[PDB]
Paper text:
Human cytochrome P450 (CYP) 2C9, a member of the CYP2C subfamily of CYP enzymes, is an important drug metabolizing enzyme and represents as much as ~20% of the total hepatic cytochrome P450 content. It is predominantly responsible for the biotransformation of many prescribed clinical drugs that include anti-coagulant (S)-warfarin, anti-hypertensive losartan, anti-convulsant phenytoin, anti-diabetics tolbutamide and glimepiride, as well as the commonly used analgesic ibuprofen. CYP2C9 is a highly polymorphic enzyme that includes over 60 classified genetic variants, with at least 20 reported to possess altered activity. The CYP2C9*8 genetic variant, predominantly found in individuals of African ancestry with an allele frequency of ~0.06, is a missense variant (449G>A) that is mostly associated with reduced enzyme activity towards various drug substrates.
The structure of CYP2C9*8 complexed with losartan clearly illustrates the amino acid change from R to H at position 150 (R150H) located on the surface of the protein. The sidechain of histidine at 150 is oriented towards the solvent and away from other secondary structural elements. On the other hand, the CYP2C9*8-losartan complex showed two molecules of losartan that include binding at the active site and the peripheral site, as observed in the WT complex, but lost one binding site in the access channel. Furthermore, the structure of the *8 complex demonstrated the rotation of the H150 sidechain by about ~60° in an alternate conformation compared to the sidechain of R150 in the WT complex. On the other hand, the average KD for losartan binding to CYP2C9*8 was 8.95 ± 0.97 µM, which was comparable to that yielded previously by the *2 variant (9.0 ± 0.5 µM). Importantly, the orientation of losartan in the active site of CYP2C9*8 is inconsistent with the demonstrated metabolism as the site of hydroxylation of losartan is located further away from the heme iron.
Numbering used by the authors: 28 to 490
The structure:
C-alpha cells in the first residue's frame, strides 16, 4: 500500500486540493494532516512527498541508490531533455554524471584550475560594475553574465567579453528558455495532459533556442577536434573527446557528440540561472541589512587586503562571510521541491511499498526552514550558521543543493562563484538602495516550483 493521502477525485486525482501558485506551502499544509510521507495523484500518476529532515535523509542518503531516479513528466519528451545529466536515468546518467564530477574537480581539466576561471570572472564582474559609474542599476543582466561566462570558460576553455555578440545571443536564448520553462502552464498544467501537447508552439520555440546553442557547441567541438593536445585537455570538450577515444573499442558508448551537446546544454541551464538568482538575492539581502554587509567588509579588509583578489583559502578564515553565503542559500530556498525523483526499483519505506518508477517530491523547504534547527527560519540571520564564539556552525539541514546521489553536480563551483563574486563586489564597492532600506521587501515571490527575489535597483559606489 502506497503512503496515505487525501482521497483522489476521479481522473483529476488531487489537483483541486493543491494551490499550484505555491506548491511548497500546499505540501507543508498536507504534512500537518498526513505526516512526513504522503501520496498525491496527479491524474492517476502517484507522487510520494517526503517532508522533514528525517524522511528526506532516510530516502536520499540511507536509501540513496533506490531514490536516485529522475521523475519524468511529458515536458521531458516535449523539450527533449532526458539526454544529458539533469533529466537522464540508468547507465547514461551514472556514466555522464561520474565523468562530469571528475572533470569539474578543481584541477580536473589541466593546469588552469576552476578557481582561476572564477577569479578571472570575478575581476571582469568588478570592472563591468565600475562602468555603471555608480548610477541606479537593475543588476539582473550583469549578475547573469558572470555565472554564464564561468560555464563558457569551463566548456570552451575561454570566456567572452560581455559586449561580444555571440555571447549576448547565447545569454538571450538561455534567459528566454528559462523564463518559458518557469511558466506554470509549461511546468505544471501542460504536464497534466499525458499525450496531447497543448503548447506545441512553445515547445518548438524551446527547441529552436536549444538548436542555436547546440549549433554553437558543435562549431567549437570541431575547433577542439583539430587542435587536440592529448596530454593537455584545457576544458570540458577536450576531456569529453578524449573520453570518447578511450570508449572507441566499447561502442555503443554513452559518450557521443550528441550526448556532449546535450550535457553542455544541461550545464548552461543548471549553472547560470540559480547562481544568477542567488547573487541577485544576496545583494538585495545585503542592501536590506547594511550591518551584515559591514561585518563582511571588515572580514574582507582584515583577512584580504585591497591589493589582491579573494581566493578560496580565505573562506576558512572568514566565518561570518561563510555564514552569510550559507544563510542566503537557506533563506531564499530557490528550489523548494528540488527536481522530482523516482525510485529505481520496488522499495519498502516505513512499511509502505513504493513501486519502481513512482515519482518522489523532496521538500527542501521543510529542511532549510526547520524551526528547531533554524529558530525563526523565515528570518534572514547569519547567526543560523555561527556559534556563540563567532565560528562557522555547519548544519546537516543545509541542503539548498539537495542530497544523496543526485546532489547538485555544481555544488563546489556554485560555492566558489558565491564566495568570490560576493567578496570581490564588497571589497570594491558599498551598496546604495534607491528606496530607504526599511521599505525594501525581501520575501521570496513563488511561481509554482521556483522562488525569485522581488525587482530592485541599487548603486555600486566605489570604495
Ligand atoms: C546556487 C546554485 C545552485 C543551486 C542552489 C543548485 C541546486 C540544485 C539542485 C537542488 C539540484 C537537483 C538535485 C536533485 O536532483 O535532487 C541541482 C541539480 C544539478 N545542478 Fe545544480 N544548483 C546550482 C548551481 C549549479 C551549477 C553552477 C551547476 C554547474 C555545473 C549545476 C549543475 C547541476 C546539475 C548537472 C544538476 C543535475 C544533477 C543530476 O541530476 O544528477 N548546478 N542543482
Ligand atoms: C507553431 C510553431 C512556432 C514556434 C515558434 N518559434 C518562435 Cl521563435 C515563435 C515565437 O512565437 N514560435 C511560435 C509560438 C506561438 C505561440 C506561443 C504561445 C505564447 C503564449 C501562450 C500560448 C502559446 C502557445 N504555444 N502553443 N500554442 N499556443 C509560443 C511560441
Ligand atoms: C539555450 C538552452 C537554454 C537552457 C535549456 N532550454 C531547454 Cl528546452 C533545455 C532542456 O531542459 N535547457 C537546458 C536545461 C537543463 C537543466 C535545467 C534545470 C537545472 C537545475 C534546476 C532547475 C532547472 C529547470 N528545468 N526547467 N526549468 N528550470 C534548466 C534548463
Ligand atoms: K502554435
Amino acid at each position: 500500500k502506497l503512503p496515505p493521502g487525501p482521497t483522489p477525485l476521479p481522473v483529476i486525482g488531487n489537483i483541486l486540493q493543491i494551490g499550484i501558485k505555491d506548491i511548497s506551502k500546499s505540501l507543508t499544509n498536507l504534512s500537518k494532516v498526513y505526516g512526513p510521507v504522503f501520496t498525491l495523484y496527479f491524474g492517476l500518476k502517484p507522487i510520494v512527498v517526503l517532508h522533514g529532515y528525517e524522511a528526506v535523509k532516510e530516502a536520499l542518503i540511507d536509501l540513496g541508490e533506490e531514490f536516485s531516479g529522475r521523475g519524468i513528466f511529458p515536458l521531458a519528451e516535449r523539450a527533449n531533455r532526458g539526454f544529458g545529466i539533469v533529466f537522464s536515468n540508468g547507465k547514461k546518467w551514472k556514466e555522464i554524471r561520474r565523468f562530469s564530477l571528475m572533470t569539474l574537480r578543481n584541477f580536473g581539466m589541466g593546469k588552469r584550475s576552476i578557481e582561476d576561471r572564477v577569479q578571472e570572472e570575478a575581476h571582469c564582474l568588478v570592472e563591468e560594475l565600475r562602468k555603471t559609474k555608480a548610477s541606479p542599476c537593475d543588476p539582473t543582466f550583469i549578475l547573469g553574465c558572470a555565472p554564464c561566462n564561468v560555464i563558457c570558460s569551463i566548456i570552451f576553455h575561454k570566456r567572452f567579453d560581455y559586449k561580444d555578440q555571440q555571447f549576448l545571443n547565447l545569454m538571450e536564448k538561455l534567459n528566454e528558455n528559462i523564463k518559458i520553462l518557469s511558466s506554470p502552464w509549461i511546468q505544471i498544467c501542460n504536464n497534466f495532459s499525458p499525450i496531447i501537447d497543448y503548447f506545441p508552439g512553445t515547445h518548438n520555440k524551446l527547441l529552436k533556442n536549444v538548436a542555436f546553442m547546440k549549433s554553437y557547441i558543435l562549431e567549437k567541438v570541431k575547433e577542439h577536434q583539430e587542435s587536440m593536445d592529448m596530454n593537455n585537455p584545457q576544458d570540458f570538450i577536450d576531456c569529453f573527446l578524449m573520453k570518447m577515444e578511450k570508449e572507441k573499442h566499447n561502442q555503443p558508448s554513452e559518450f557521443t557528440i550528441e550526448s556532449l551537446e546535450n550535457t553542455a546544454v544541461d550545464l548552461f541551464g543548471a549553472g547560470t540561472e540559480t547562481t544568477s538568482t542567488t547573487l541577485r538575492y544576496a545583494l538585495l539581502l545585503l542592501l536590506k541589512h547594511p550591518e551584515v554587509t559591514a561585518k563582511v567588509q571588515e572580514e574582507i579588509e582584515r583577512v584580504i587586503g585591497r591589493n589582491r583578489s579573494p581566493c578560496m583559502q580565505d573562506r576558512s578564515h572568514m566565518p561570518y562571510t561563510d555564514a552569510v553565503v550559507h544563510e542566503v542559500q537557506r533563506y531564499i530556498d530557490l528550489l523548494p521541491t528540488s527536481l522530482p525523483h523516482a525510485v529505481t526499483c520496488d522499495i519498502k519505506f516505513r512499511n509502505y511499498l513504493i513501486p519502481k518508477g513512482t515519482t518522489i517530491l523532496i521538500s527542501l523547504t521543510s529542511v532549510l526552514h526547520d524551526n528547531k534547527e533554524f529558530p525563526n527560519p523565515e528570518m534572514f540571520d547569519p547567526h543560523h550558521f555561527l556559534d556563540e564564539g563567532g565560528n562557522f556552525k555547519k548544519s546537516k539541514y543545509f541542503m539548498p543543493f539537495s542530497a544523496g546521489k543526485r546532489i547538485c553536480v555544481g555544488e563546489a563551483l556554485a560555492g566558489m562563484e558565491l564566495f568570490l563574486f560576493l567578496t570581490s563586489i564588497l571589497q570594491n564597492f558599498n551598496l546604495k538602495s534607491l528606496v530607504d532600506p526599511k521599505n525594501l521587501d525581501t520575501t521570496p515571490v513563488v511561481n509554482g516550483f521556483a522562488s525569485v527575489p522581488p525587482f530592485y535597483q541599487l548603486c555600486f559606489i566605489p570604495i
